[PDB]
Amino acid sequence: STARPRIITSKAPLLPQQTTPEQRYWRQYTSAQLVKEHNSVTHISFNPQHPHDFAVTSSTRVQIFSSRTRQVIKTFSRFKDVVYSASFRSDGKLLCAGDATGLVSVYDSYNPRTILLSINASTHPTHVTKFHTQDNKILATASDDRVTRLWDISNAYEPQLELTGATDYVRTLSFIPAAPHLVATGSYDGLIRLYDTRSSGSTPIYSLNHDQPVENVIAVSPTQIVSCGGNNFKVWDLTSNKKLYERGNFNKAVTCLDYVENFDSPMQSALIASSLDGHVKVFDPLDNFQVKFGWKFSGPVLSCAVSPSTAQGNRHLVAGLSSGLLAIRTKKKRMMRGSEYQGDQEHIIHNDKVRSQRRMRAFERNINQFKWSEALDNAFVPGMAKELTLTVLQELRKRGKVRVALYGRDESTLEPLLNWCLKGIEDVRSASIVADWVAVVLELYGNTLESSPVLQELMIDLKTKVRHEIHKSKEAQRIEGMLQLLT
């Protein structure tokens, strides 16, 4: 003996925009929940050590959401002006928020009733603050006093390091993720700088010039960093000290970046960017930073962030727009005692239990039970789909006989064949099967066409559909001709 061959479903052949696995994995992000906020959602950060929380930065009101239920769980509203930068320490325990009054405050997580300490920065709005990645207790704050500073939170009274050397509107910081003594900054004249923290820290050891005023500087490796300003993002490498990639597939200036490594995906590394245009686009740092997928939202997206590498639950993409709301696109990952014994100590184990197959279709068991006319009739029920109907038509063509499947019909049951065939003749992959099926039905039912008046209008508008389709295919043949000219 043998088994039974499963009735295949011949899907769509090589149409363009083919389904690549990276766009499959990003395509399965569903349920785009849209949450209103009060003002422009400037900054969004995530929780490092338990990637289950993310912090959003509205005007005067910093919220933190959880990834399990995607509702607001805590607020932070002891801010005397608009609040700008929200960041987490790497042990996930304390939230640093830089506001516009300059008194940059650090709370701890889930306890807004206790401000841990208030760093007095300059009179200028402290526009970005973030903790160090390697060390915990050093905190980088850049205000628009054309300067940035490193504070030790233990010795919170004084600036531990005073990083000057930037001209106009210092705006982003990132630390080189292997050597902790290398701190990279960005300003609004371009000229992405970086400094050694052991040095005096008053001039960059080497600067890198994005010609546009740089908008975000992140690190994806110890070797290469990614800086963006204007309508293109440029990858620089520190070892070659040189720009080596630039993609400009946007309209307006790209406004935020981030990176994710080693997470559960066919695409290993992924750098996604928000672009102030309505699009957030993912780029693949493996093969020369090509674009891979892009989500469109209903206004200029001002920041975006994805869930980190080890999220362990519902993985998130989030993007705060400047219009006043926020987009979350998520993906989600005593008598019967012996009857679980499962054979531990026993000598010889025998196993031939057949797995239950998935449930066969109605037309599949009809063709397998050889009732061919019933297979055709249960095939042309409007509860079925296009590829299923095409495959049962292909099956009856290839194996049985369409003459046999039509040998006992009448005026009535010959209608839904032609009624499907009207929609089926127009598209590409069906029209040959439509052609020979309506050809053999008009071969076999000519005298009933003479008697019965009902399907005559079906034959008439099938003639019109054939004329419409021969006109369309003739002009497409003309386009094939003129491409043969242009080659």
Binding site: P16, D427, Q477
Partner: protein, 141 residues
């Protein structure tokens, strides 16, 4: 499985491919809208792409394609090819679009040294559309 049985054929995850498709080797013009198509072809925004593609006036299409920069018309009719591969019910009202780019700009993409490698999707779609003529003539007969 029994030890005297021909193993059943399996489709699995086979990409069915057609061999015809391959991989690689005062102003006084008109006031109508094509720089929307230019910066809707910079990015990929299907909403305003369908807003600029659901017109049908031929002279308007002429002046828009004429004002269009030629360097991105190749990916213009690439994405028109994927639109007409997705559905062929309104084939003509942008078959006019996929021909007028050729008519207005031909020599630039002729002088482009790799035509069929990056236009291999569109003429594959059109030969898929046009290779079934004889039996539909038989249908009509």
């Amino acid at each position: 499985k029994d030890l005297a049985s021909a193993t059943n054929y399996v489709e699995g995850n086979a990409r069915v491919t057609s061999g015809d498709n391959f991989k690689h080797v005062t102003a006084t013009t008109t006031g109508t809208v094509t720089v929307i198509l230019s910066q809707a072809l910079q990015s990929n925004d299907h909403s305003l792409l369908e807003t600029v593609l659901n017109n049908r006036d031929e002279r308007v299409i002429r002046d828009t394609i004429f004002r269009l920069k030629p360097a991105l018309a190749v990916i213009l009719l690439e994405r028109l090819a994927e639109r007409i591969a997705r559905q062929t019910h309104r084939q003509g009202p942008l078959n006019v679009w996929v021909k007028w780019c050729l008519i207005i700009h031909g020599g630039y993409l002729v002088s482009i040294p790799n035509l069929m490698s990056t236009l291999s999707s569109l003429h594959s779609t059109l030969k898929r559309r046009s290779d079934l003529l004889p039996r539909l003539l038989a249908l009509d007969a």
